[PDB]
Ligand binder design. Structure first.
Ligand SMILES: Nc1ncnc2c1ncn2[C@@H]1O[C@H](COP(=O)(O)OP(=O)(O)OP(=O)(O)O)[C@@H](O)[C@H]1O
Ligand SMILES: Nc1ncnc2c1ncn2[C@@H]1O[C@H](COP(=O)(O)OP(=O)(O)OP(=O)(O)O)[C@@H](O)[C@H]1O
Ligand SMILES: Nc1ncnc2c1ncn2[C@@H]1O[C@H](COP(=O)(O)OP(=O)(O)OP(=O)(O)O)[C@@H](O)[C@H]1O
Ligand SMILES: Nc1ncnc2c1ncn2[C@@H]1O[C@H](COP(=O)(O)OP(=O)(O)OP(=O)(O)O)[C@@H](O)[C@H]1O
Ligand SMILES: [Cl-]
Ligand SMILES: [Mg+2]
Ligand SMILES: [Mg+2]
Ligand SMILES: [Mg+2]
Ligand SMILES: [Mg+2]
Lengths: 265, 266
């Protein structure tokens, strides 16, 4: 069921293979209730992840503007204890970052053992906007996708469990959400009219997003998450993360004392 | 029990016994929780303005003993903020590399950027707390480190980092009940170490060194002593402290370079 959103290995896909506005037959109220119940489970499993200190989880969120990366971090990553989470929001590369290979700044933020890392935007930006606006060509993009895959294989072998999530919104949904930034004086700061050129290039972005999804493997899957309904985005992401953590199955560590014997004065 | 009653006024002498560990301001748990919920929305609005403005930052330092509520305060109150605007650092025992530098080197690295709320779960004060109790530094070195801490805070203040230091004030009996609950719950044994009960036996030495630390309280960089036996009351008071700081900072949404009513989205 959630697995219907997993990009299966070894076959290219089209973003239009998935609807942008699924609800799995649930009411918003039912979905939000389930999300709240999942939050408690996410917290217990993340506490076990940290206590164990042998494994880590890396969620990569990659999506167009207004698709809900920020909201998903707030609502779903907010279920975890913030002491066991590292969030990085990757913005335009600095001069220093540009003077290195494109994974230098990405690798530095990979999570330590016991932690959940979150990448709001990621190494995939280096094969997304860069291709649409012709800063790299297809041969370079192919090389970078291979290097991305090798990087993910390296983290997997380090017991970093990788989950990549594409938040799938329709162009009309994006347009409503952007218009809502223009209409709210508290949100103008968040709206850049120069960014509207990206909408003119919507299909070109589909094209390069579809190539990014080709790094989906059994060990490092991409999920296409219908995100027009923000509550359903949060519900599906909660299941994805909880499924990952249950499969990682981190255990509380052995202790070197007998608790029944301890006397607190 | 009004919020400025919890501020450590500037001066040379601080006594933790001046504050109770279990204030409730006359509120029930349900009333206080309702008020904390209302304040969360205001915290989120002001932190968005802080970020959008990009001129100032907020640095909350939480410094308290085990089971006093640092973790829970970060979860409940710092959780009101958009996490994209928050940078949390939990300072643990210094690594060999950290120890080969001055004691503020690893602290300064984590100071917040403009637009951000930084949270230190433990802080530069650790270097004049546990290190004193167990005789790794003497008093003369502790006094010199307190001076360097004050200078460091003055530097951040002059960079428009608003510094708020919070001591979570719990009673020994409340701490005992909370530590017993870790023992009683198999899912919490991993964060109970019997070795740490030595710190409880040094409760008064820790009072002494905390009271010295609290003398860095200034009008620009205040300490607050937050009665934290009631976890809901801790969260309520902390929410008010942070909200009062943000409102005084008064971050403004920035001027924009376009007219919104003329933009036509296609
Ligand atoms: N490797 C990269 N190369 C070029 N641009 C990048 C790279 N990584 C991130 N960026 C850009 O940095 C910008 C960050 O902008 P900002 O923080 O304002 O959020 P945003 O514009 O809302 O981002 P998004 O369009 O993903 O929602 C995004 O446009 C993103 O595409
Ligand atoms: N500068 C420092 N020098 C020595 N020890 C430090 C320093 N900074 C932090 N520590 C110690 O690192 C330890 C962190 O241990 P841990 O993450 O297990 O949390 P904890 O034991 O619950 O901390 P706390 O007693 O503050 O609640 C704390 O005991 C703290 O005192
Ligand atoms: N669920 C969790 N996820 C990630 N880290 C955690 C979690 N629970 C505890 N920790 C870390 O483990 C250490 C011991 O936890 P503890 O419950 O003592 O929290 P704390 O931050 O020291 O707060 P307190 O003031 O209540 O002691 C702390 O370093 C804390 O950050
Ligand atoms: N309240 C906030 N506090 C801190 N940073 C914020 C806040 N709101 C937005 N940002 C940052 O500003 C930028 C633009 O915000 P935006 O709402 O587009 O978020 P986003 O993460 O790009 O998510 P989306 O997929 O919805 O575009 C992002 O870089 C985001 O991290
Ligand atoms: Cl010194
Ligand atoms: Mg955006
Ligand atoms: Mg943009
Ligand atoms: Mg503790
Ligand atoms: Mg301890």
């Amino acid at each position: 069921d959630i697995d219907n959103y997993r990009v299966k290995p070894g076959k290219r896909v089209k973003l239009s293979d998935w609807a942008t506005n699924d609800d799995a037959g649930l009411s918003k109220e039912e979905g939000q209730a389930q999300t709240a119940k999942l939050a408690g489970e996410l917290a217990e499993w993340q506490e076990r992840l940290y206590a164990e200190g042998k494994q880590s989880l890396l969620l990569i969120l990659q999506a167009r503007d207004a698709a809900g990366k920020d909201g998903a971090v707030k609502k779903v990553i907010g279920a975890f204890n913030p002491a066991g989470v590292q969030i990085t929001s990757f913005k335009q590369p600095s001069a220093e970052e540009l003077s290195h290979d494109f994974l230098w700044r990405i690798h530095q933020k990979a999570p330590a053992k016991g932690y959940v890392g979150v990448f709001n935007r990621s190494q995939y930006e280096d094969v997304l906007v860069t291709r649409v606006y012709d800063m790299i060509d297809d041969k370079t993009a192919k090389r970078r996708l291979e290097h991305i895959r090798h990087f993910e294989e390296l983290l997997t072998d380090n017991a970093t469990r990788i989950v990549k999530v594409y938040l799938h919104i329709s162009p009309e949904e994006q347009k409503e959400r952007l218009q809502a930034r223009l209409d709210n004086p508290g949100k103008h700061w968040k709206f850049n009219p120069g960014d509207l050129k990206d909408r003119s290039n919507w299909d070109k972005f589909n094209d390069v997003y579809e190539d990014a999804l080709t790094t989906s493997t059994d060990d490092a899957p991409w999920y296409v998450v219908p995100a027009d309904r923000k509550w359903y985005r949060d519900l599906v992401l909660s299941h994805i993360l909880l499924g990952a953590l249950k499969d990682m199955n981190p255990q509380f560590p052995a202790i070197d004392y007998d608790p029944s014997k301890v006397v607190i004065h």
